[PDB]
From a paper:
The NTF2L domain harbors the binding site for several types of proteins, including host proteins that regulate SG assembly (e.g., caprin 157 and USP1058) and viral proteins (e.g., non-structural protein 3 [nsP3] of alphaviruses). Most of these interactions occur in a mutually exclusive manner via a common binding pocket in G3BP1/2 NTF2L.
D3L appeared specifically in the Alpha variant, whereas Q9L was observed in a sublineage of the Delta variant. Nonetheless, we found that the G3BP1-N interaction was essentially unaltered even after the emergence of SARS-CoV-2 variants. To determine whether the G3BP1-N interaction was affected by these mutations, we expressed N protein with mutations at these residues (D3A, D3L; Q9A, Q9L; P13A, P13L) in HEK293T cells and tested their interaction with endogenous G3BP1 by co-immunoprecipitation (coIP). We confirmed this observation using surface plasmon resonance (SPR), which revealed a lower binding affinity of N1–25-P13L peptide (KD = 2.6 μM) with purified GST-NTF2L protein in vitro compared with N1–25-WT (KD = 1.14 μM) and N1–25-D3L (KD = 1.10 μM) peptides. In contrast, the aas surrounding F17 on the N protein were in close contact with the opposing side of the NTF2L binding pocket, which has as its central components G3BP1 F124 and G3BP1 aas 1–11.
Numbering used by the authors:
A (entry chain E): 14 to 20
B (entry chain A): 2 to 118, 120 to 139
C (entry chain D): 0 to 46, 48 to 137
D (entry chain B): 6 to 117, 119 to 139
E (entry chain C): 0 to 43, 51 to 139
F (entry chain F): 14 to 21
G (entry chain G): 13 to 20
H (entry chain H): 12 to 25
Write the structure that this text describes.
């Protein structure tokens, strides 16, 4: 599942 | 239904999530960015020149909050996305954005998405957003 | 002797824009020299009216450049953003007007990813080149 | 919208509907539309296509699609004749929570009266296992 | 004299397949004759190309050498504009590589100036092995 | 937007 | 006429 | 240091 969020 | 990822699918999914978040919870946008991420969202300085980019999650949180995104509406007309360096994805966006129920304003934007380092998780390394009217106007 | 800091992303970007659009006017048959094996080039959505896929490497890009028949190419650059990105690269967003073959100036954006060439100091190549006219969308 | 965008959006909507309400799949098709979804006849030969909403609906309800899960591995779409879109699809389809089965599929989508509205003129679907196995 | 019905889609499709994969083995340098000014071709980083000239260039690039084909199944259905949509499921060996599963999607359109003459409007090839995993 | 359904 | 193939 | 320049990496294959 493609997901987004900073380190 | 599951789809095998490609840069183009990553980029279109990203643009959807970003502009949905800008409308629903702009105060969470800063969570897409890291310490070395760049961010600009149009603007003219007091000298009439294009506004400077800022760097890192703290400055980006300040800058987003300073833009007063209220009931943001976007019509995306163009998304293209390509694999780039270091398994990144470069994303080109054109569309219209209305803030605070004002007139739609054309924009030209580039993202660089980079692997967060969680499979198929990405963060925004670079967000370059300009309104056409402040550049061409 | 004289030691200075590494060229900034904005200096590399501004010098890139100067050489790229000059070459487009003066010797478009030489533009392919800026690209490497792994470079992607995308110039508008439609070619003879057909959807145009990205092409890769110097030969396919030279061919794509030649097919666009750049003649008397006039460029007005209105704004350049250039930021540090992944792998010591530079992401550039160009906003400007372009006339090909004496047609009217049309608003465009162009997204580039520039990467270190690896063997010569301060030498870069174009890893990603993404062009779109505004009217397109 | 590009042929690829039309093709990808169609494929997601088709396989979503096959899960949520396969009884409504017939709504995508017209009187001259073709449909086959794998199968082997009583002689072991690949099943024949059927034509038109009534027979397509009958054939779909015959499949007893239940809780189907879909993995789309490949979608290619080109402009074709009469502003249509030809779509090539490879992926895996699980029916009634049994094993995923590889498939090879072709659609021809054609302009419907409404702008950017399309209907399925042709739906060719084959499971790899019945053809190569 | 003798007059017969129009050839069925599947008779056009089976005859096409026979001629196409024979020419791929015997003289791939002559494959360009099947296409028109508006034809699309992709042998799936591959970009799609259009017209006999660009298609000839792409076909010569693939360096088809000692091409062995096992056709496992052909579907061929009437489509738009008196066309035939063809799906091929087969195995292909190029340059003495191991046989690999493929599909190929063709749209065949009437050539216009000759009865029962067709050209290839759309040609989409994909190997399975580079899609599944 | 892109929509799908058979002709009437 | 038999089934034949070629660009227009 | 040399000035900013542009070109692809060495490729003797191409």
């Amino acid at each position: 599942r493609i997901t987004f969020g900073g380190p | 239904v599951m789809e095998k990822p490609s840069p183009l699918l990553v980029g279109r999914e990203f643009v959807r999530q970003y502009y949905t978040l800008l409308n629903q919870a702009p105060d969470m946008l800063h969570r897409f960015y890291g310490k070395n991420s760049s961010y600009v969202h149009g603007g003219l300085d007091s000298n009439g020149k294009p506004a400077d980019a800022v760097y890192g999650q703290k400055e980006i949180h300040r800058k987003v909050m300073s833009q007063n995104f209220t009931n943001c509406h976007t019509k995306i007309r163009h998304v293209d996305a390509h694999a780039t360096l270091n398994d990144g994805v470069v994303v080109q966006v054109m569309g219209l954005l209305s803030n605070n129920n004002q007139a739609l304003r054309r924009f030209m934007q580039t993202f660089v998405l980079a692997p967060e380092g969680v499979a198929n998780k990405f963060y925004v390394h670079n967000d370059i957003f300009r309104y056409q009217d402040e550049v061409f106007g």
